[PDB]
Symmetry: C3
Subunit: 238 residues, 3 copies
């Protein structure tokens, strides 16, 4: 089929990179479909969350590449579900996701330097910001590949599950996110984006300006009510 598969399942959009005979290596068609999917995530108020995964037991001016989430980030949470090889492109795009599940046999690495290529997916910026400095330097400069266990130990992913279970676990996480207040979830995400690189005192001013509107919503009344009643809240995104 198409080089990326796209399915809406309730409030979650699932995007599957889909060239399994080529280890889901990126194609022009794949990237075009991915950008259309990002647009749908950002613009459809019924979408509360997105999952990025790969088919067939694999995962996967040029300063802005929308498909690869470099210079663009989704306005709703993005969960990665990684099976198998995620070297090169896969580890780069992983860094543009927010919450991260790896199957036991998944493999990560940025090996561009081994072949005297430069990583075009933004790893030289992001990796030192997401895992400890020295480990990020080791991975980028040696091109060492790592296991899912090692990736979890260093904080590159948050969850490790048995092989074949990454997408199931990601769907569990998405169900939780979809059940949380979309106005609050999306406001938190915007603060995380906007306050990068600032002293915290400057950041708090933006944090408050972003967050205050959440309390005006019908959802901000229903939430505490549902909590008191020990039931699932019924949020309406307003």
């Amino acid at each position: 089929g198409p080089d990326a598969l796209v399915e809406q399942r309730g409030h979650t959009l699932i995007v599957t990179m889909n060239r399994p005979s080529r280890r889901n290596a990126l194609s022009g068609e794949m990237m075009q479909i991915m950008v259309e999917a990002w647009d749908r995530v950002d613009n459809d108020p019924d979408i509360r969350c997105c999952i990025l995964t790969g088919a067939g037991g694999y995962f996967c001016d040029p300063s802005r590449i929308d498909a690869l989430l470099k210079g663009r980030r989704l306005k709703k949470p993005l969960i990665a579900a990684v099976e198998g090889p995620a070297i090169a492109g896969g580890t780069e795009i992983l860094q543009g996701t927010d919450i991260r599940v790896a199957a036991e046999s998944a493999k990560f690495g940025i090996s561009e330097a081994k072949w005297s290529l430069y990583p075009m997916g933004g790893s030289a910026v992001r990796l030192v910001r997401q895992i400890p400095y020295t480990v990020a330097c080791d991975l980028l400069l040696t091109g060492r590949h790592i296991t899912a266990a090692e990736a979890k130990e260093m904080g590159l992913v948050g969850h490790v599950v048995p092989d074949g279970q990454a997408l199931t676990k990601a769907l569990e996480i998405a169900e939780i996110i979809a059940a949380n207040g979309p106005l609050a979830v999306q406001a938190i995400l915007r603060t995380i984006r906007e306050t990068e690189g600032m002293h915290e005192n400057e950041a708090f001013k933006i944090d408050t300006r972003i967050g205050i509107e959440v309390f005006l919503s019908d959802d901000a009344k229903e939430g505490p009510q549902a909590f008191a009643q020990k039931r699932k809240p019924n949020f309406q995104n307003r």
Copy 2:
């Protein structure tokens, strides 16, 4: 008694959030007493360190909230001693502390988004700066609660101790801090605050300007002397 308890024990001020019938939920009185305590920490040269804890087996424009250490940070080190539930407010204020002890059964989490509320204690700014990016996103966007062990594994706290021992461990740490050179301890803390969000080359200029005065002190002579004599230094904060 008062909604926050305050005791000076040698060079350490101990602040205990104290509404144990309400899981030490914040009150106006609690916050007023906390701000008075922060003032005392900053202004009393005899105070070298502060501990924030909760009673009864629990822990706990709006861009600046002094009581919650958002837009204000103590000029002397602040050690958290966390027993039991520290969800919501407790996990937020935890991020304004410097050194962190959790009892085995302590529980952390920022669950505001579950109820379509926004976290008003600055977590959307700080958490991604204090634990790995992906884990911070997971906690804030799902509202997942975590154990003390998990909190230690991700770097949210530094020490885990048996239940009922968090304050004892914190007092041990405070004794060490109180025995170190207050001029040096406080200078280090100021550099950490002031250099946030700068390239390191700009930061080193501030680091040196802050640190140089420490060497002019009587304490900077007594320290190396005491080291050579294998005795506890007698620092005078000058």
Copy 3:
């Protein structure tokens, strides 16, 4: 011999701090030789990597101190190989290295505050950027010493090896770095340096400007060829 030893071994320069009767405590001569070595690393195109180690079973305006890599960073990767005590100066200079191997019995710590001294090697800036915030605060403010295992757990070093093996492991890592494309390795390193303290969207513009030239090189053609042929690439630094 000289207070720092310097050897070129193929594409790797090895710098050994060498006052083993004084636990490799820094001297004027040691620092002078170190700066000459940094110059050689930066300026000799045949050098692809550097190792900093200590002899004899030990490791080791003032806003810029070249010898201690404060306000200056090497243009090629720097790997630390730490045997034994690395307290004070050793832990500070460690933070200016990129990839880090510790022997089992190595000890780290910044104990200046214990003696009412200020750390002049830039730790008050860097440590909170390299390990989790709360752990960095604990180490700097208490002066607690840590084991190699603890250093690995917190992300201060990347590798732990048996005693006497730190330099051997570092040479293994250097062989890998030396075999990678120097143009790509060095470009990645420059992006990591230049993009510190910026929002990622500003950083990507610099990342791309730095990286694009790598693809014009003869090395960028030989790399993928060698990969396809399952052989070691023969890079020429052009």
